[PDB]
Amino acid sequence: VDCALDPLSETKCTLKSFTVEKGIYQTSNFRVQPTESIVRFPNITNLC
């Protein structure tokens, strides 16, 4: 079974069994990747 595919498939991997009994199981955390990186350093011109 491939874990990174169907939602059902993911459940088997955390459970570590081919057959899963009826219930609610938590498989993986969901986080949102940062889309972009923004840098805001001081605008001072002179070279130290």
Added chain:
Amino acid sequence: MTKTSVDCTMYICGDSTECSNLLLQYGSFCTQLNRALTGIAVEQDKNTQ
């Protein structure tokens, strides 16, 4: 009591990828903690019932 679930990965290693790989070396400690906590959270529902 209030059911609290803590993700071992998020709290320890943090967002950083490097922390995730180092965490993996330790073993199922991150996972084992989750099992204990949900079970406490599951238990609290059973008590009210």
